[PDB]
Each structure stands twice: as structure tokens, then as C-alpha cells.
Amino acid sequence: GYTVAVVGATGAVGAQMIKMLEESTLPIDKIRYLASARSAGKSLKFKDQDITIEETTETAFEGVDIALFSAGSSTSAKYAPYAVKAGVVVVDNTSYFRQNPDVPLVVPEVNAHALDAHNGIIACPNCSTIQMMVALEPVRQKWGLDRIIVSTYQAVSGAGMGAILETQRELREVLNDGVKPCDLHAEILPSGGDKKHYPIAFNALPQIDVFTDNDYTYEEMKMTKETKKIMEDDSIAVSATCVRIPVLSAHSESVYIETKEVAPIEEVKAAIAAFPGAVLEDDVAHQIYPQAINAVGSRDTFVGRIRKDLDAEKGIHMWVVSDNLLKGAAWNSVQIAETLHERGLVRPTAELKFELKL
Amino acid sequence: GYTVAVVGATGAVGAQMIKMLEESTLPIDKIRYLASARSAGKSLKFKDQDITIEETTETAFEGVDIALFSAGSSTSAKYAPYAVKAGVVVVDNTSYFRQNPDVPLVVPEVNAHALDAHNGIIACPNCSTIQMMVALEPVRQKWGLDRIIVSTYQAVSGAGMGAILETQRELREVLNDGVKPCDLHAEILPSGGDKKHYPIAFNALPQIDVFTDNDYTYEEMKMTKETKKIMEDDSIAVSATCVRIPVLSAHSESVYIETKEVAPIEEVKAAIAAFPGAVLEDDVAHQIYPQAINAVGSRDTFVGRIRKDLDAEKGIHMWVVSDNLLKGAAWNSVQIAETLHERGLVRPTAELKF
Numbered sequence A: 001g002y003t004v005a006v007v008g009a010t011g012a013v014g015a016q017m018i019k020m021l022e023e024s025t026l027p028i029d030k031i032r033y034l035a036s037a038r039s040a041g042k043s044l045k046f047k048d049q050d051i052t053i054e055e056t057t058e059t060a061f062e063g064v065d066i067a068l069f070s071a072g073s074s075t076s077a078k079y080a081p082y083a084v085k086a087g088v089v090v091v092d093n094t095s096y097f098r099q100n101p102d103v104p105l106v107v108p109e110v111n112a113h114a115l116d117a118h119n120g121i122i123a124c125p126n127c128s129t130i131q132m133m134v135a136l137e138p139v140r141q142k143w144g145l146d147r148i149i150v151s152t153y154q155a156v157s158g159a160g161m162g163a164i165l166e167t168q169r170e171l172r173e174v175l176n177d178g179v180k181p182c183d184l185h186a187e188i189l190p191s192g193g194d195k196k197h198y199p200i201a202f203n204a205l206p207q208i209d210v211f212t213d214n215d216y217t218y219e220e221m222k223m224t225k226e227t228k229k230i231m232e233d234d235s236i237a238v239s240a241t242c243v244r245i246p247v248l249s250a251h252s253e254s255v256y257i258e259t260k261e262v263a264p265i266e267e268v269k270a271a272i273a274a275f276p277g278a279v280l281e282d283d284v285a286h287q288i289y290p291q292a293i294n295a296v297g298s299r300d301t302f303v304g305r306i307r308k309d310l311d312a313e314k315g316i317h318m319w320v321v322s323d324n325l326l327k328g329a330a331w332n333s334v335q336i337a338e339t340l341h342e343r344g345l346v347r348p349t350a351e352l353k354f355e356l357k358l
Numbered sequence B: 001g002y003t004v005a006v007v008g009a010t011g012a013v014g015a016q017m018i019k020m021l022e023e024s025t026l027p028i029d030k031i032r033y034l035a036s037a038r039s040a041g042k043s044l045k046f047k048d049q050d051i052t053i054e055e056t057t058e059t060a061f062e063g064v065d066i067a068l069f070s071a072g073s074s075t076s077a078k079y080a081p082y083a084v085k086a087g088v089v090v091v092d093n094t095s096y097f098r099q100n101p102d103v104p105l106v107v108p109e110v111n112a113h114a115l116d117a118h119n120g121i122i123a124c125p126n127c128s129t130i131q132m133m134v135a136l137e138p139v140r141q142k143w144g145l146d147r148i149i150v151s152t153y154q155a156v157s158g159a160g161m162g163a164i165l166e167t168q169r170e171l172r173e174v175l176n177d178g179v180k181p182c183d184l185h186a187e188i189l190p191s192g193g194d195k196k197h198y199p200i201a202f203n204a205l206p207q208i209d210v211f212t213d214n215d216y217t218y219e220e221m222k223m224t225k226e227t228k229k230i231m232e233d234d235s236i237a238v239s240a241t242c243v244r245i246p247v248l249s250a251h252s253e254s255v256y257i258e259t260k261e262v263a264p265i266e267e268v269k270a271a272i273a274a275f276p277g278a279v280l281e282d283d284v285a286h287q288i289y290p291q292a293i294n295a296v297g298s299r300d301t302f303v304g305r306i307r308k309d310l311d312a313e314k315g316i317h318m319w320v321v322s323d324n325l326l327k328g329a330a331w332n333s334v335q336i337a338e339t340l341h342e343r344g345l346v347r348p349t350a351e352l353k354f
Helices: A011-022 A073-085 A108-117 A127-143 A161-177 A218-230 A265-274 A326-342 B011-022 B073-086 B108-117 B127-143 B161-177 B218-230 B265-273 B326-342
Strands: A002-007 A028-035 A043-046 A049-052 A066-069 A089-092 A121-123 A147-154 A237-244 A251-258 A278-280 A301-308 A315-322 B002-007 B028-035 B043-046 B049-052 B066-069 B089-092 B121-123 B147-154 B237-244 B251-258 B278-280 B301-308 B315-322
Touching: A002 A011, A002 A073, A011 A028, A011 A043, A011 A326, A028 A043, A028 A049, A066 A073, A066 A326, A073 A089, A089 A326, A108 A127, A108 A326, A127 A147, A127 A218, A127 A251, A127 A265, A127 A278, A127 A301, A127 A315, A127 A326, A147 A218, A147 B147, A161 B161, A218 A237, A237 B251, A237 B315, A251 B237, A265 A278, A265 A301, A315 A326, A315 B237, B002 B011, B002 B073, B011 B028, B011 B043, B011 B326, B028 B043, B028 B049, B066 B073, B066 B326, B073 B089, B089 B326, B108 B127, B108 B326, B127 B147, B127 B218, B127 B251, B127 B265, B127 B278, B127 B301, B127 B315, B127 B326, B218 B237, B265 B278, B265 B301, B315 B326
Parallel strands: A002 A028, A002 A066, A066 A089, A089 A121, A147 A237, A278 A301, B002 B028, B002 B066, B066 B089, B089 B121, B147 B237, B278 B301
Antiparallel strands: A043 A049, A147 A251, A251 A315, A301 A315, B043 B049, B147 B251, B251 B315, B301 B315
16 A cells, blocks of 8 residues: 655645545555644544654655645645655645646546656646536537636635634624624635735625736636646637635536537436536426535535527536535545556656756 | 605515605605505605505505506506506516516616607516616627626525525524534525525525526526517527525626627726716726625616636626615616606506506
């Protein structure tokens, strides 16, 4: 079995990663937990064993076969290249390596073949990207895709624990103390790093991440760029509007597509139902459709409201929901690690293609 | 002056109708409140004057110039044809007369000219439709409009007071009593006319109203059909996804359009900013965009996030927000009445058609 490291083992992101790993089929002979110097010497569970946390350093990766990063971009930028030099295969959680041409950007049900050429680092995509790829891939392979227009209804958990607590506090102030939504004080949302912060309670914020020079946000542009790379087709026209709403867990997406050939709705439904990691919830006669609150805790991507556009012959609308913390993050990362093993790709990389910082 | 009747004055819907009348530039002599026989006799405020609520009947509309309806569809179907008979001009809030060719369907900034040929009844359009029309008309008049794709983020107060109370109840249960949103009991949302009910707390429900034959909901089909009638163009392609989110007041909409000719984004902004009833909240450098929270209490339709589609040359994306109880309903109706007055259309109708 493997020596596996979790890099950024403390905190809510790390805990999510641990949980998925604990339920993994991956044969693990040794587990190691890596975090900041402040956390070193502390203890966290892995299954029935207490694991002493070690500090992430340049020298900390000796003997490690697989490393699951679950921290920020600065940790990945600093330590992933050293992991690779030590002979590790890195599965990175952040956006940092995603657009690097030497790095596969992978959703295992969609483009597992891209893993074969890896150079020691595989990137997990953005949570809003992942679920859309799961829903659309089965349609693309049978009828192609020309364009995507998506409007998202994204959960606050995507911005971390701080954002979830901010959301609950603001809602309690409104409903328990009679504070007006306009009088709320926000500190994190819509974006932690940006200059101004706004209440999410009883609101809809059309900003996730910060703005880019073209007036789309980085979140919207990630959906555009990650789709093209994952599906390996730069001619797929993708445009997105990313909106945060008062939901703690699970993103919802309103998805419009136009296929290359006319796709019979009954056949689109059947194709999604048969696709791994996807579940059809579409029976409008009984008001069956995907719902955020029903998806929390499940690894599945749920699709419904599938219907033809009223005018465009090849246009289809659908509703896509998934738990952003599982398939949107930790489960996709662990599934990548299982897929690497599945295909015989856990091996040291001879040529270092990522420069050493520090 | 005018004698103005509010039909369905009791309840939450009539309440917001009253507040808009109190602020109206309309010359009012006598205000009258009409409702159920169960509500008749009670007292209700107009500015500071107490008004005796009368019973809504087939003969109660004598001497009334304007009647604003804010009740159910069955009240409009029954009593509007008697008001027109008595000589009243009716401004209806429900869906009942919306698709009747003899009935104008008006957003005053957009299609005020349609009022000219009314036959005693003018219909207020759906709340989700109204704000979209205000945002898009200034674009259409300069560069045309080929298609619209819209996804809505709709407030619970569109479904009535009951739905609002249900939402607060559910949220309090989650936050205070530790109930999983999963396990919440619900009786209203997504629709009181449908068989099954789901929690809205920390949820997004892609169902508003009931399903039609083509797997779109009536709400989605309303946005399609009402747009075509309001803008008087059956060639405009319109498809909608209508979603309920945990907001009490103010609808938000992600709107995509393809124009007929290319519309420069700076000019599109300038035209919207100059259009009556529209406000441009669009400065991304300082994170300025319309917000439900900010739209509440205002008659304005707020537009921002305006940007070019990354691929289609004529494609434009935007974010549209308005108070659904005001411009989406009560204000639009009172504004219709104000326009009828300024255009000299408050007068008995000769040829009865209802």
C-alpha cells in the first residue's frame, strides 16, 4: 500500500479531506498529516489511530507516495514542487496549477485519460465546474456541445467556515434580534480578499471571487477556462454568471446548452441516468427535481428540469445540483487518487517541470 | 377628482396597494375599500382617515372612476365585468385577463400606447416579467432584440404572506432548534396549488407555480407569453427558468439577450441609465451591482453586471433586481392608473366585452 500525506490537515477543509480518505478504497500503509508550525505536535484521528501532525517543509515529503493538498495557493506553490522532487504524486486542491499546460485538470468520470501523461501534479477543478462537467459529459459524447450559458446559485460553504458562521450570525440577528438586512455588518462575503463586504442574509450576491479586467469574475472565468481544458475543446463557447445565495451547502446551476446535433430529451435523460457519478431526478408529474438540501452528504451530481428550448432547435435547459464540499472538492480529489492507482500511475516523476521556490 | 376603489383591500396584497395610492399624484376625491362580506364593516386607514370596508357586490361600483383589484383571480373574473358595466376603469392584478386580446397588458414605461384602446380592463403583468421589460426596452429600441434567456432568483413574497411566514418559521427551526433543512415540514412552497410541498430554508426550488404540458412551469410560460404581448412582437425568442430562493422581498434575474445589431456596452449602459424607472448600478471596480436587500422599498428597477458575451457577438449578460411587491405589483398598477389619467383614458366604456 501507500504512504499518503494530507497537506493542510487542520481546519474544515482538511477535515473534509480526511473524511473522504477514511472512506477510500486506496490501500494505505502509512498516513501522515502536514500543517503549519503552530499545529505541529497536535493530534488528529485517522480511522482508529491518533496521528501526530508534522510541519510542512521542503524536506517533509521523503517516502511519500501520494500527497493530498487541502490548503491555499501559497502552500501549493511553495510545497508541491518539492513533493514532486521527492518522488511524490501531488493532487492539488487550489486554482494555482489548474491552467499549467504540464498539469492535468481532472474530473475522473470525464477525462481520466489525461492522467496518463502527468508530471507529478494533478489539479482538482473548481467546485462549480466539476458538477457541470458530470452533467454535460454524457450529452457531449452522444450529441456534442457548441455552447454553454450557466447561471449559478452557490452555497456559502464554498468560501470556507468563516463564511458559514457569518451567514448563520447574520440570519440569527435578523430573525432573533429584528435587525434589518441592510443594517447587517459583513466581514467575509462576497469575497474575503476584496475591499468591500456585503450581507448574504435574505440577499443574492452576483460576485464570487474578484473581478477580472473583462468584467467577469474569476469564478465565472474559471468555469469558462476549466471547461475548455477538461473537455479538451477550445471551441466550446462558455459564458457564466456566478451568484452567492443564502445556502450553506450544495451549489445549484441553471444550465443552457446547444448541442451539435439534435438531442431527443428522453434520450438525454436516459444518457445522464446511465452516466457514473450522475443521478437523474426528473419527474415533473411528481415535482421531482434536484434540491440543494437533498444533495448535502451525497457524492452524486443530480440533474433535472431537462427540457428543450422553446425556439432553438438544439437548445436544452437543465437544473444541476451537487454538494460542493464532496464531489466539488474532497471527493473529487480522493477519486483522482484512486483513479491514479486504478490506472497504475502512482510513480515518481523523472523530470521536474515545476520550479522550486524558497 | 376621482373616486378610487381598492377591491381586495384586506390582506397583505391590498395593504401594499394602499401605500402606493397614498403617495399617488392622482387627484382623489373619495377612496373606497372593498373586500369579503366577512371583512365588511371593519375600519382600515387611508393616510389618516378611517375607511369603512364595504362588501364587494355586483352594484357596489356605482360612481367609481377607477378600481384597483388586488384579490384572487375568482374576484376579478366575477366583479370586474360588473365594474366596467357601472362605468369604472379596472386595473387588474391577477393573471385572469392577461391573455385576453381585448385587454391591454401594460408596463407604463414600455407600452403606454396600448392603453389607448382599452375596453374597461387593463392587466398588470407578472412580477418577474415587469422588471425584465423595464431593463430591456431601452436596449430593444436602439439595437433590437432577437432572444432572451433568463434564470430567476425569486423572493417568497411573490407567493403571498403565508409563504413569507413559512420561510421565517423554517429558518428559525434550523438556526434555533437544530433541525436539518432536510427534515423541515412545509405546507405552501413551492406552490399552494400543487400536491407536494418542500422546504425553502437554505434551499433553491426550481419550481414556481404549477407545471404545464411542455415541462415548463406557468411562471416560465408567463415570462415567455407576456414579453411577446408587452413588446408586441411574437418573433422574440424567450425561455425561462424560475427559481425560488430564501429571500423575502425583491426578485433578482440573470438575463441573457442577443440583440439585432451589435450594441456597444458603454452605450447600452447609458441608455438604461437614461430610461425612466431604471437605475444603473454598475461599477465593478468598486463592487457596485444590484442587490435584493438594497432594492426593497424602492420603485426602481436596478441593472448591473452588464457585459459582453465571451463568444456571440450580439450577446449581452446582465443582473436585474426590483422589489416584487412594488414595481412587480402595486406600484405598476397605481402607475397604470396615473398613466390612464395623464392620457385622458379614465372614462366609461361603451361597448361591454366582458
